[PDB]
Amino acid sequence: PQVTLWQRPLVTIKIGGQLKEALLDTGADDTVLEEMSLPGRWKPKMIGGIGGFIKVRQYDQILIEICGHKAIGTVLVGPTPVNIIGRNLLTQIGATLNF
Amino acid sequence: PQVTLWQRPLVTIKIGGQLKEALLDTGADDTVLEEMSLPGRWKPKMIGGIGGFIKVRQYDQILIEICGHKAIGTVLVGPTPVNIIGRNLLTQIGATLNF
């Protein structure tokens, strides 16, 4: 679809058997999810945003379905205020920005 | 232009007679520029990101030219690490997300 940006561009995802909604985010290099149970191992990472740094767990090869589109990739889980889909997964579902 | 997202979607903006590059950010509701001196009167506001919150000054009715398309709106200025064009202006320049 085409998303105009008068609304937050939110979409439904499934990950880990759970249903979430997440923001489509061109400024975010990677995907960050609020606190979740993910099957696997993880690495600690910190990322920085507007107000500072947060510590997240990196999990790799996680399957997500963003609308009816599957992508596999890295997901960071942490204390974000909002679930964010970033450019690592956006490229996989073929998203573009047009003006 | 159609921007694919294998690299950061950065564009050249002209604001207050200065030239700057800024990230096109669909996740961000508003536009936040790094400290820059920009003429007029303003209010303080606090915005929250990942990591937490920064105090910004906000100026309304600022002219921006974003990739050589004009718009006028609110610009927040404050200690952001990257200049962000958010939805408030993305909407005026007609941007859409497509997948």
Ligand SMILES: O=C1N(Cc2ccc3ccccc3c2)[C@H](Cc2ccccc2)[C@H](O)[C@@H](O)[C@@H](Cc2ccccc2)N1Cc1ccc2ccccc2c1
């Ligand atoms: O903090 C934000 N980040 C950090 C971010 C997020 C995920 C990441 C994943 C991997 C690596 C880095 C990441 C960084 C990005 C902007 C940004 C990018 C790079 C450096 C600094 C900032 C994001 O693109 C932007 O939409 C929002 C996401 C968000 C939305 C809502 C609530 C929390 C976080 N803001 C706050 C942001 C940005 C601008 C705003 C303007 C007005 C009002 C609120 C604003 C909030």
